[PDB]
Structure formats: structure tokens, C-alpha cells
């Protein structure tokens, strides 16, 4: 029946998503079933589950799938097929023009470094969105196009790096869309001495306090954001609560993932204003598990 073999069964990937749905009371929202049938068709991947917390409200129908192989053309085209199947519902409209602009011409797929596809679903259809992420490196023409779609000043444009850039696309089911750029610094960089004292001129000490816990730090820039979003990639999930005083709603998500098998790393995302507050009430939390075939 099957042609390609893997030590990973599709059921293992769907169980990880199912544990998340059971833990956070997720009932079917469109197009979650279509997304799970797409997940089941992938090869090696990382699956990332997330919660967004706003005061006492939890939005937990957030899943990203990262392709772990190098078949970039294939993985972008299967992800887009998922977007177009979702859009076939007559009362769903997706505006793909921003992605079309980014991929126009003779796009150089050998410059792609990373791809993810994902969802963030809500009870109101029009507030739900689909997601595509593409990381590129050393690709001047398309880094220029991404910067132009993001609509940032020439000052800020100058501060983005040229070797690598993570780029996200959001498609709401009522036709709204946005791009986000995520410039970043690795541990070796944000401890380089020219770099850090420069960081101290744009960010508060509160924002800098968690850096010893992290191996990656970044900032999300998007026309859709009300303020820049800070991103921290912690090396150890068990260090999180000592440095991030989150509220009880966020604590339910974190306490669950402290006991799930998977990665020991974690992302947290929040505005700088939240880092200066006594208690964090508005925060996103991300946890993941890898699915890699063991047959050599």
C-alpha cells in the first residue's frame, strides 16, 4: 500500500496535537480537520503547540509544523495547496497578494533555509487565520521585497541583517493579511560586547534580564502589531518561572508542558511593556516535539 517508509507513524503526530486539544478544551473549528490531514502526510518535522493568553482568556488553537528536510520547493507547494483547499469554503476569502509579491519572478528556492505552515483558530470564523513562514539567507532581491512589504522606516531597515531572515505571513479567513519580519541575534552575538551595549540603547534592563537563559533573541516587526514583540528562546523550560512572573491562566499552559515529552526548549513572546510590569498578563507560550525517522 505505502511506498515511503518511516519509523514515525502519522498517529504519533496526531496524538501530540490531540493531547493539546484535550488539555485546552479545543472543539472542532474550521479548518482544523483539514490541517490534521495535512500534518499526517508530512515526512520528518517538528510540531509546535502554543497558547496565547490575554488576561483571563486563553486562545490555544495554535499549531505550527516545521518541515525538517531540504525539499523546499515541495514543502512550499504542499503548504500553499493547504491554503487553497481551506479557501474553497464559499464564505472564506484569503488575500494571498502579499505572498504572491514575495514569491514572484524566478524565485530562488536554493536560498530558502526553513519553512513552517500553521493555524491560529478562533470561535469567530473571520478572526481565525492561517500561517506560512519562510526563512531566507543571502538573497538581496527578496530581502528587499520583504522589507518593503513590512513598511518600516529607512532607519529600521538598516538594522536588519543580511545573512538570514525569518519571515511570517498571516492570512485571516475574512480577507485581511499581514507580513512580519523577525530579526534575531544568537547567544554568541548578544554577548559580543559591541552588540550588548548597543542593545542597552534600545531596550530596557527589564527586557534584557532574561538573556542569560536564552540561546536566541528576536523582535517581531509587523504593520499588524500594536507594538514590537520580544521573542526569547529559552534553553531550559525549567528556568522559565524564575524569570517570567506569568498569571494563572498562562501557568495552566506552562504547567502542562512541564510534564509532556518533547523538547526541553520553549519560546515566550510578549511586548516590552509586559516585561516592565509586576505580573505578565499578555503572553504567548510555545512548546514542541520532534518527529524524525530513525531508519538510516
Amino acid at each position: 500500500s505505502k511506498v515511503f517508509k518511516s519509523t514515525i507513524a502519522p498517529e504519533e503526530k496526531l496524538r501530540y496535537i490531540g493531547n493539546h486539544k484535550q488539555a485546552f478544551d479545543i472543539e472542532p473549528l474550521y479548518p482544523l480537520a483539514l490541517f490534521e490531514e495535512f500534518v499526517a502526510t508530512t515526512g520528518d518535522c517538528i510540531i509546535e503547540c502554543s497558547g496565547k493568553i490575554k488576561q483571563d482568556q486563553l486562545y490555544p488553537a495554535r499549531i505550527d509544523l516545521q518541515f525538517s528536510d531540504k525539499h523546499h520547493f515541495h514543502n512550499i507547494h504542499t503548504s500553499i495547496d493547504f491554503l487553497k483547499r481551506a479557501a474553497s469554503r464559499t464564505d472564506v476569502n484569503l488575500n494571498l497578494d502579499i505572498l504572491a509579491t514575495f514569491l514572484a519572478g524566478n524565485f530562488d528556492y536554493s536560498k530558502v533555509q526553513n519553512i513552517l505552515a500553521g493555524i491560529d483558530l478562533r470561535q469567530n470564523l473571520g478572526e481565525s487565520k492561517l500561517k506560512l513562514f519562510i526563512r531566507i539567507g543571502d538573497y538581496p532581491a527578496k530581502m528587499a521585497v520583504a522589507k518593503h512589504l513590512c513598511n518600516i522606516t529607512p532607519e529600521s531597515e538598516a538594522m536588519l541583517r543580511s545573512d538570514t531572515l525569518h519571515i511570517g505571513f498571516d492570512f485571516y479567513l475574512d480577507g485581511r493579511s499581514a507580513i512580519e519580519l523577525y530579526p534575531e541575534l544568537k547567544k554568541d552575538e548578544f554577548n559580543h560586547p559591541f552588540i550588548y551595549n548597543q542593545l542597552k540603547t534600545i531596550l530596557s534592563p527589564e527586557a534584557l534580564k532574561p538573556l542569560p537563559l536564552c540561546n536566541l533573541f528576536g523582535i517581531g516587526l509587523s504593520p499588524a502589531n500594536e507594538a514590537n514583540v520580544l521573542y526569547y528562546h529559552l534553553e531550559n523550560i525549567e528556568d522559565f518561572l524564575s524569570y517570567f512572573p506569568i498569571n494563572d491562566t498562562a501557568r495552566r499552559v506552562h504547567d502542562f508542558y512541564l510534564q509532556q515529552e518533547g523538547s526541553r526548549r520553549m519560546w515566550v513572546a510578549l511586548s516590552e511593556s509586559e516585561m516592565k510590569a509586576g505580573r505578565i498578563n499578555n503572553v504567548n507560550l510555545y512548546y514542541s516535539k520532534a518527529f524524525t525517522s530513525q531508519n538510516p
Binding site: 517538528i46 513562514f133 536566541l216 523538547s263 514542541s288 520532534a290
Partner: peptide, 5 residues
């Protein structure tokens, strides 16, 4: 461990 280079 998603989204990294």
C-alpha cells in the same frame, strides 16, 4: 525547537 536556523 521550531523557527530556528
Amino acid at each position: 525547537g521550531a523557527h530556528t536556523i
